[PDB]
Every structure is written in C-alpha cells, then in structure tokens.
CSV table of C-alpha atoms in Angstrom, one decimal:
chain,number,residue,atom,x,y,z
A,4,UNK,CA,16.1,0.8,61.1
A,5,UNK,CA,19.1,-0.8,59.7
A,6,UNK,CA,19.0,-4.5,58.0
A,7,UNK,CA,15.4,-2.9,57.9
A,8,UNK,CA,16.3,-0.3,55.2
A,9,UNK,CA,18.4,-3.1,52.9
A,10,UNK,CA,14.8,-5.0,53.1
A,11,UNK,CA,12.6,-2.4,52.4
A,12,UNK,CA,15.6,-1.4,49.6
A,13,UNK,CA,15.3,-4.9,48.1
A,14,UNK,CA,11.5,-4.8,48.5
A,15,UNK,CA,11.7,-1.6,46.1
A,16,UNK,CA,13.5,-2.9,43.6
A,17,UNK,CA,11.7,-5.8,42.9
A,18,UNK,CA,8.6,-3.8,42.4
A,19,UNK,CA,10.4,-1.9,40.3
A,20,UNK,CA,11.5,-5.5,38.3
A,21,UNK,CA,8.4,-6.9,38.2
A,22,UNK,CA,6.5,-3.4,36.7
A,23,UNK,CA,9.4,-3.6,34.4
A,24,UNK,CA,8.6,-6.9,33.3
A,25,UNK,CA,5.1,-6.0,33.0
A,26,UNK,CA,5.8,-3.2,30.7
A,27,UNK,CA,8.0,-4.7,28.4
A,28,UNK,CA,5.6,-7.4,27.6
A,29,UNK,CA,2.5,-4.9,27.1
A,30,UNK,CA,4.6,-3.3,24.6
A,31,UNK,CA,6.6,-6.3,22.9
A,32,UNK,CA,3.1,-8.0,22.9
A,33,UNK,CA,1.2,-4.3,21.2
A,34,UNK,CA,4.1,-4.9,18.6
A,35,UNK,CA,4.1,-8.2,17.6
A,36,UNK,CA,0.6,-8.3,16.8
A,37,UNK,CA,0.7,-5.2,14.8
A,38,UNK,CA,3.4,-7.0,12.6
A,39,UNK,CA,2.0,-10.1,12.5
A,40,UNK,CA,-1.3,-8.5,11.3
A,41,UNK,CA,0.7,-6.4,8.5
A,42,UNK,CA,2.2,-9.8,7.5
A,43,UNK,CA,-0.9,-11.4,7.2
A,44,UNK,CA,-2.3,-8.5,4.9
A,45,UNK,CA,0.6,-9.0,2.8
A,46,UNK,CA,0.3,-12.8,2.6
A,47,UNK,CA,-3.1,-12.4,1.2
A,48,UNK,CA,-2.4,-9.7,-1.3
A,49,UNK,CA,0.8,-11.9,-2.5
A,50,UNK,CA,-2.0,-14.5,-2.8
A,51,UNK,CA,-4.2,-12.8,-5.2
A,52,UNK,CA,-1.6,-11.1,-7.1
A,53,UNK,CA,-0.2,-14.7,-7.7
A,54,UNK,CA,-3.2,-15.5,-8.7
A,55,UNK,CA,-3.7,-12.8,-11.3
A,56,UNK,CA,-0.7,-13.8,-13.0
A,57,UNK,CA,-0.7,-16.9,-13.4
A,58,UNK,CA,-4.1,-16.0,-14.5
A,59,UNK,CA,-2.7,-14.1,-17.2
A,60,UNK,CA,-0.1,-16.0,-18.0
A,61,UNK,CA,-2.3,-18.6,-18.6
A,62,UNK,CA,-4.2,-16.7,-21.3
A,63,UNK,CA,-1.7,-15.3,-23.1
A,64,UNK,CA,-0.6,-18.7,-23.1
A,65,UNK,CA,-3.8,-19.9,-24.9
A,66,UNK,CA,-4.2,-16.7,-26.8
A,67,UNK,CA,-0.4,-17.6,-28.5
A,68,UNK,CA,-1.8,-21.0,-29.4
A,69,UNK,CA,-4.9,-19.4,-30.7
A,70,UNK,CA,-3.1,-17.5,-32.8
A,71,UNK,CA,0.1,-19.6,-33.8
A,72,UNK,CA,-2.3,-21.9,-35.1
A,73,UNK,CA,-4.7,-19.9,-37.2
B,4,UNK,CA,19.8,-13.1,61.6
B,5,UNK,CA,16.4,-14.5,60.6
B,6,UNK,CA,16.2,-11.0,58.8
B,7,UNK,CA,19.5,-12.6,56.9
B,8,UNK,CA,17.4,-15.3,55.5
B,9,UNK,CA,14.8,-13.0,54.1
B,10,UNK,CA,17.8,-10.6,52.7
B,11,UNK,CA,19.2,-13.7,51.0
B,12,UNK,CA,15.8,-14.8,49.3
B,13,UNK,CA,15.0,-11.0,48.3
B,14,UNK,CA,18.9,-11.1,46.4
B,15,UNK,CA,17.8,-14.2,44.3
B,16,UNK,CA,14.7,-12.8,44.0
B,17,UNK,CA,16.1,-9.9,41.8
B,18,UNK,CA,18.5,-12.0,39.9
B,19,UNK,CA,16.2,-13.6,38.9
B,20,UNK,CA,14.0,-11.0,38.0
B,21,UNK,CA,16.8,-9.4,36.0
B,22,UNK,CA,17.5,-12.4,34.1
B,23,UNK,CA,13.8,-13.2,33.6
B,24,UNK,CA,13.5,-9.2,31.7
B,25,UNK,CA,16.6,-9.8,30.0
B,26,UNK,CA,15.6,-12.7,28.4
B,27,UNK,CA,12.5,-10.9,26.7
B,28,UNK,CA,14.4,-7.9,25.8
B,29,UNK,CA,16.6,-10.7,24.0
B,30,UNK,CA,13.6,-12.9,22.4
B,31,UNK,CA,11.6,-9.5,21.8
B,32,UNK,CA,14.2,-7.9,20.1
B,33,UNK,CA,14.9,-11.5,17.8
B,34,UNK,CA,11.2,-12.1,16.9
B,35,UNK,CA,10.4,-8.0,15.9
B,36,UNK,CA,13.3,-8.1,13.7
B,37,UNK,CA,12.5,-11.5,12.1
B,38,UNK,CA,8.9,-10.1,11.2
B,39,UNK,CA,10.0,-6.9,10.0
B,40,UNK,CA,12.0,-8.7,7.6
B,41,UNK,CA,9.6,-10.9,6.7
B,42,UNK,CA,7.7,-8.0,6.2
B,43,UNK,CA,10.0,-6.8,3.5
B,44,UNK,CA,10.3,-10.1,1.9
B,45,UNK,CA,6.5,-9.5,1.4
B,46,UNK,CA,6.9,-6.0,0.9
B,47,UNK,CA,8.7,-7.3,-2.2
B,48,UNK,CA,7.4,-10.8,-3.4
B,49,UNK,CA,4.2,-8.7,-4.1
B,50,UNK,CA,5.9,-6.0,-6.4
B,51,UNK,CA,7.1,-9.3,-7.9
B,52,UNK,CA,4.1,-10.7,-8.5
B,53,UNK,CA,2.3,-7.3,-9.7
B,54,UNK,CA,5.2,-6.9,-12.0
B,55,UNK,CA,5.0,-10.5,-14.0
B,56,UNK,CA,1.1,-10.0,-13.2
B,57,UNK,CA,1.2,-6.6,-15.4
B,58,UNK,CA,4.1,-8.1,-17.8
B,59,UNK,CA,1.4,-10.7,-18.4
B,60,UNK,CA,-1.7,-8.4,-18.6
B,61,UNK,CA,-1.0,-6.2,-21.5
B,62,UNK,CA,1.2,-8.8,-23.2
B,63,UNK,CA,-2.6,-10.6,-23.7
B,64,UNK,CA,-3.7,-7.6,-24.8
B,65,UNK,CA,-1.5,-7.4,-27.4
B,66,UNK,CA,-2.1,-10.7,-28.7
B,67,UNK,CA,-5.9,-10.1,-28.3
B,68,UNK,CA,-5.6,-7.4,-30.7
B,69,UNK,CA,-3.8,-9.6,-33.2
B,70,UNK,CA,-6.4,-12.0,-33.3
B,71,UNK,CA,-9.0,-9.4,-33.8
B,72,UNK,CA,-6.8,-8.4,-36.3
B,73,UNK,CA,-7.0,-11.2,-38.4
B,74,UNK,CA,-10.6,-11.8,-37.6
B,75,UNK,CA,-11.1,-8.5,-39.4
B,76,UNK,CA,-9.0,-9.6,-42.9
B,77,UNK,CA,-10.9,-13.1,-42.4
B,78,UNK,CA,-13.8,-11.3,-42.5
B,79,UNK,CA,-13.3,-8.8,-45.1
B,80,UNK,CA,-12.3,-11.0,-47.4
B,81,UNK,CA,-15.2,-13.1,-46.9
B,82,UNK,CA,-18.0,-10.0,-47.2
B,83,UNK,CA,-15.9,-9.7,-50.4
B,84,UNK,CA,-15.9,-13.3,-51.7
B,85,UNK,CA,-19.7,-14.0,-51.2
B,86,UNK,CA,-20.2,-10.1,-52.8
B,87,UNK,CA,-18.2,-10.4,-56.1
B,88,UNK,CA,-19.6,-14.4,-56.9
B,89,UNK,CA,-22.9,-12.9,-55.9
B,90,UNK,CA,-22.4,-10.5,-58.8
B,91,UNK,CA,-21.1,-13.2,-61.0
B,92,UNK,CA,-23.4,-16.1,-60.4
B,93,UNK,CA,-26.4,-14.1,-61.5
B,94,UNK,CA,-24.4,-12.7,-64.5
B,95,UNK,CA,-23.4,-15.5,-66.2
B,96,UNK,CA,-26.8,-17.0,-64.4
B,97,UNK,CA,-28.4,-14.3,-66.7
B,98,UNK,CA,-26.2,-15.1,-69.9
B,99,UNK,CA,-27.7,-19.0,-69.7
B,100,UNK,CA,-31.0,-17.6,-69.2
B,101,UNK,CA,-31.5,-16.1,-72.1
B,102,UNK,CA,-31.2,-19.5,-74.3
C-alpha cells in the first residue's frame, strides 16, 4: 500500500470515465436518431402538402380562366 | 519511482478522458437543439402549407359551383329556345300548309 492506492484510485476513475463516455453516447446516439426520424416524417408530409396546394392552386387557377372567359 | 511514471500517464489519461466527455456533452447538446428546432420549423412550414392548401381547396370549390352555375342558365335557356321555336316552326309550319 501507498503510491499503490493513488494507482488503483486513478485506475477507478478512469473506469468510471470511460463507462461515462459510453453512456453518454448510447443516449445522445438513442436521441438523435429519434429526432432525425421525426424530421424526416415531417419533411415528407411538408412534401405532399406542398404538393396539394400547388395542386389546388393550380386549379383554381384554371377554373378562374374557365370562368372569366365564359 | 517507476510507479511515478505510471501515476503520470494515468493523470493524462483522465484529462483526457474528461475533455474527450466534455466535448460530447458540448456537440450533443448543439446538434439535439439544432434538430428540435428544426423540428418546429417543420412543425410549422406544414401548418403553412395545409393552411394555403385548404385556402386553395374550397376556394375551387367555390368557383366549381359558379361554373355549374352558369352551365345550368346555359342550359335552361337552351331546353327553352329549342322548346318555344319547336312550337312555332310547326305553327306557322301548319299556317303554310294549309295553302
């Protein structure tokens, strides 16, 4: 014992770093991907409701020409 | 001594370590909060585009209606037209024939 304990000490602690480390990224990494999967959702729906409309603001478009001209 | 070498590789080894967690708090923290606002900047270009979507929907409908509208008085006044000379071209259709 002596310089022994300061080792053993340091030896601890850096396991205790390392499963730290570990940790974090598990749980920054179950995160992230749950986001970046909302965000995909989202892009798509944005997609198809921006298709909609200028669907329909196509037509009414046409169906105000249709009818101007008549 | 050669224990003092060991000591002094096992202190860098945990500065290290702490700066190497640190960091990822740090970037974890920066990327989370750049998707949840991204998130909301989704969250709302959608209610934007479902909004002018809808705006546009029913204002079709509308217009739709109009047309049908005057499809109906076209029409009308057509089933009227070929009903009323139908009645007169076989009057005065008659009046010749009897000469």
């Amino acid at each position: 014992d002596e310089k022994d304990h300061l080792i053993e000490r340091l030896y601890r602690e850096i396991s205790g770093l390392k499963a730290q480390l570990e940790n974090m990224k598990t749980e920054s990494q179950r995160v992230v991907l749950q986001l970046k999967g909302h965000v995909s959702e989202l892009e798509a729906d944005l997609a198809e409701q921006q298709h909609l409309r200028q669907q329909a603001a196509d037509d009414c478009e046409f169906l105000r020409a249709e009818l101007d001209e008549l």
